Amino acid sequence: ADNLAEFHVQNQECDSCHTPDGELSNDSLTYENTQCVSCHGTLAEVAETTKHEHYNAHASHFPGEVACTSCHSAHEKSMVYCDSCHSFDFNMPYAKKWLRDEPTIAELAKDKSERQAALASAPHDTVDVVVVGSGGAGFSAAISATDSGAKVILIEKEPVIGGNAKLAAGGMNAAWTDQQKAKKITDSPELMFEDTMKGGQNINDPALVKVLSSHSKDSVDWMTAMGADLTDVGMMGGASVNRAHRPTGGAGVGAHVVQVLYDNAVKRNIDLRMNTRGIEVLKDDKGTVKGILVKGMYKGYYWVKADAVILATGGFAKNNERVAKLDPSLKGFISTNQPGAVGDGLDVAENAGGALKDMQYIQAHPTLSVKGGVMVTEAVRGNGAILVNREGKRFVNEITTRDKASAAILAQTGKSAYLIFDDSVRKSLSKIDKYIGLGVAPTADSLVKLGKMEGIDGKALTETVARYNSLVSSGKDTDFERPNLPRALNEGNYYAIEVTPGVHYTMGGVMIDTKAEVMNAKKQVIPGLYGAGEVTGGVHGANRLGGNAISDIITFGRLAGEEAAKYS
Ligand SMILES: Cc1cc2nc3c(=O)[nH]c(=O)nc-3n(C[C@H](O)[C@H](O)[C@@H](O)COP(=O)(O)OP(=O)(O)OC[C@H]3O[C@@H](n4cnc5c(N)ncnc54)[C@H](O)[C@@H]3O)c2cc1C
Ligand code: HEM
Ligand code: HEM
Ligand code: HEM
Ligand code: HEM
Numbered sequence: 290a291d292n293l294a295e296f297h298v299q300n301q302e303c304d305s306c307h308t309p310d311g312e313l314s315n316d317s318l319t320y321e322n323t324q325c326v327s328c329h330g331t332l333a334e335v336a337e338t339t340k341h342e343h344y345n346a347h348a349s350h351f352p353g354e355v356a357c358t359s360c361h362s363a364h365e366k367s368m369v370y371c372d373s374c375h376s377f378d379f380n381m382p383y384a385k386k387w388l389r390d391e392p393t394i395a396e397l398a399k400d401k402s403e404r405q406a407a408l409a410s411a412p413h414d415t416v417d418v419v420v421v422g423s424g425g426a427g428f429s430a431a432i433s434a435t436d437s438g439a440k441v442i443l444i445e446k447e448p449v450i451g452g453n454a455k456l457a458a459g460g461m462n463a464a465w466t467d468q469q470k471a472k473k474i475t476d477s478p479e480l481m482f483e484d485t486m487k488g489g490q491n492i493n494d495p496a497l498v499k500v501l502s503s504h505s506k507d508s509v510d511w512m513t514a515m516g517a518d519l520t521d522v523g524m525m526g527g528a529s530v531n532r533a534h535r536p537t538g539g540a541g542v543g544a545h546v547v548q549v550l551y552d553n554a555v556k557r558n559i560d561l562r563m564n565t566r567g568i569e570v571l572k573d574d575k576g577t578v579k580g581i582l583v584k585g586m587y588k589g590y591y592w593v594k595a596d597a598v599i600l601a602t603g604g605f606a607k608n609n610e611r612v613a614k615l616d617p618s619l620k621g622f623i624s625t626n627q628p629g630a631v632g633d634g635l636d637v638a639e640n641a642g643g644a645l646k647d648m649q650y651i652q653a654h655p656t657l658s659v660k661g662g663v664m665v666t667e668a669v670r671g672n673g674a675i676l677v678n679r680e681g682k683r684f685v686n687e688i689t690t691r692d693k694a695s696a697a698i699l700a701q702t703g704k705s706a707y708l709i710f711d712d713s714v715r716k717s718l719s720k721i722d723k724y725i726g727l728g729v730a731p732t733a734d735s736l737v738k739l740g741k742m743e744g745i746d747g748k749a750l751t752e753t754v755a756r757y758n759s760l761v762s763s764g765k766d767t768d769f770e771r772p773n774l775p776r777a778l779n780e781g782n783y784y785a786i787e788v789t790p791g792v793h794y795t796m797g798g799v800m801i802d803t804k805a806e807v808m809n810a811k812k813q814v815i816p817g818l819y820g821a822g823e824v825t826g827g828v829h830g831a832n833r834l835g836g837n838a839i840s841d842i843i844t845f846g847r848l849a850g851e852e853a854a855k856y857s
């Protein structure tokens with residue numbers, strides 16, 4: 290067979306997968322995927338037949354109910370989604386190599402003829418609010434608005450939910466939580482505000498940072514009330530105290546928060562549409578929002594009539610061409626992002642009249658795994674790991690800001706360094722077991738041995754760890770001034786993870802006020818248009834602190850949903 294449908298139709302009728310009229314149920318292919326499941330079982334049952342010791346196409350870290358058509362198309366060869374970040378040994382039937390080729394919004398001007406037909410038609414749906422993007426901010430805004438009594442449609446251009454938020458690991462910052470108090474941490478919204486402003490080099494909009502710090506506990510409470518576990522509180526770079534919240538044991542905050550949000554949206558019967566891209570915000574004759582033109586992958590263009598549109602589309606850190614124009618020093622770097630994080634949501638915001646700000650500030654995460662090409666959480670360092678160069682020495686305060694850590698790593702021999710930790714650090718953060726499972730954390734029972742395996746001066750590394758453990762024991766790092774020294778590296782075996790910087794997060798984006806209203810260049814509100822999450826600018830100034838983006842998307846996502854519902 291040349292394709293999956295041809296294979297099945299050798300023994301099956303068209304309606305084994307299709308509806309009675311033959312029309313595709315919707316752009317999520319809901320009915321069609323139910324038929325795959327009726328014969329093959331759920332994703333979890335299929336995964337029992339495709340086990341590999343350390344990986345499995347059908348049982349991943351992605352949250353929500355991943356549709357089979359996310360990777361298996363019927364009438365044409367299709368791509369494995371995991372290939373966008375990993376290169377696992379897979380043999381999917383009718384596969385084709387991963388290639389992301391998505392037209393820009395500007396390029397979609399070529400469909401002017403089909404777009405005009407869509408716009409001349411009646412709206413396909415008439416609702417109160419449309420949320421664009423199924424990352425943490427968009428689910429938060431959909432739930433919030435629905436809970437306030439608004440009828441929402443939440444759209445997502447990708448085949449799978451959660452954007453980059455599902456990838457988040459280190460935590461969600463918040464101050465003065467009940468969770469901190471149970472771990473005996475003392476903090477305050479004022480101190481979180483202070484750390485954030487200083488970390489962003491005072492470029493941050495202070496009114497936006499006040500919303501971030503003051504709503505932070507409430508956002509933690511809201512998520513927890515919805516079923517989230519945010520009881521583990523760790524340290525991330527640039528924070529005066531531990532305030533990065535995550536599930537018990539140090540599991541990744543991201544996939545968990547998005548799973549909780551999805552489950553809550555499903556419980557509320559929120560109309561969620563996959564493979565549906567927002568293209569153009571429509572405005573009436575007085576310039577207020579009247580709806581949005583969308584492009585369904587399977588159904589074509591159509592528009593939704595609504596009072597409000599909430600853009601929650603994420604950043605543009607996968608788009609190296611846009612990134613290099615703004616910061617030529619990041620040209621050619623690998624990204625930590627999902628494949629659709631290219632900034633089309635910003636183009637939608639701008640075409641609607643929204644202005645952008647702080648676009649030149651682009652964050653590189655200092656620690657991408659060289660071997661795996663994926664982000665290694667900063668929580669590995671916050672929980673006690675050090676960084677060594679190939680000479681087996683420390684060279685930087687490992688919990689300094691991201692700008693300084695990336696430069697210090699790139700200044701080392703080979704333009705990369707190694708995270709070094711022991712079993713005490715490993716046991717303190719369960720996320721570390723995920724790097725070991727990926728095969729990117731070689732181990733040995735001595736540093737001399739570990740060094741020999743990874744090309745690190747073994748005898749200098751041994752000395753380096755003994756010296757660092759002495760500083761931990763005395764409580765002051767006189768070599769690099771790391772202000773938090775939580776553990777000695779002296780339990781069990783040792784591990785090394787080769788790391789280098791990668792493009793991660795875009796601090797700039799659409800200008801919003803404190804009600805998450807999108808504004809134009811004259812600082813005028815565009816009635817009905819909201820923005821929330823990494824697509825906005827002004828919250829994080831020149832450098833975002835680790836943990837502050839998950840805090841931002843919940844707080845601003847929730848706020849946008851409530852304001853949009855009220856506006857109506
Ligand atoms: C690997 C990784 C780990 C991280 N860890 C942390 C952490 O621990 N703490 C922290 O503070 N931050 C962390 N960050 C950053 C944080 O995850 C993000 O900034 C992300 O959660 C922002 O969420 P968001 O909702 O704004 O956007 P995203 O979660 O990226 O979701 C936006 C969604 O919009 C969809 N979309 C985009 N354009 C359109 C369009 N035109 N039409 C329809 N849909 C569209 C995208 O496909 C995407 O699904 C991490 C980021 C990454 C990449
Ligand atoms: C889009 C929907 C579906 C998906 C993604 C899917 C997936 C697949 C895949 C990848 C294969 C292996 C192909 C090969 O080896 O070349 C397969 C085979 C098979 N499929 Fe499907 N399938 C779908 C729908 C269905 C339905 C509706 C039925 C039954 C009515 C079905 C029954 C089978 C059977 C019997 C086989 C052969 C192997 C076996 O006995 O399990 N599939 N399917
Ligand atoms: C000869 C039998 C079939 C016919 C005539 C048929 C017809 C079609 C048509 C016309 C489309 C495009 C619809 C549109 O763009 O609006 C489509 C798409 C689709 N069909 Fe089929 N179909 C058949 C068998 C199957 C089978 C056996 C499967 C699953 C194993 C399947 C699953 C799908 C899916 C998932 C889509 C969405 C796009 C894609 O994945 O290719 N169909 N079909
Ligand atoms: C319930 C949902 C799905 C169904 C029913 C389904 C069906 C199947 C089947 C029947 C096979 C062949 C297994 C065999 O050798 O007998 C297969 C293989 C595969 N599928 Fe799926 N699939 C689903 C979802 C997905 C998704 C969402 C992805 C990607 C994220 C994916 C990627 C693959 C890959 C890469 C292979 C080859 C596995 C390997 O080489 O280990 N599938 N699928
Ligand atoms: C269904 C698709 C995928 C599969 C089956 C898969 C598989 C895996 C596996 C086996 C690991 C090692 C730890 C573990 O067992 O979970 C891992 C880790 C990781 N993967 Fe994926 N992957 C998928 C897609 C992606 C994509 C598209 C991205 C990036 C956008 C990504 C980002 C990461 C990261 C950052 C890690 C490090 C550990 C963590 O943060 O949990 N993965 N993946």
Ligand SMILES: O=C(O)/C=C/C(=O)O
Pocket residue numbers: 457458459460654665666667668834835836837838839
């Ligand atoms: O877990 C991390 O290293 C990423 C945190 C962040 O981007 O805030």
Ligand code: NA
Pocket residue numbers: 604795796797798822823824825826
């Ligand atoms: Na931004």
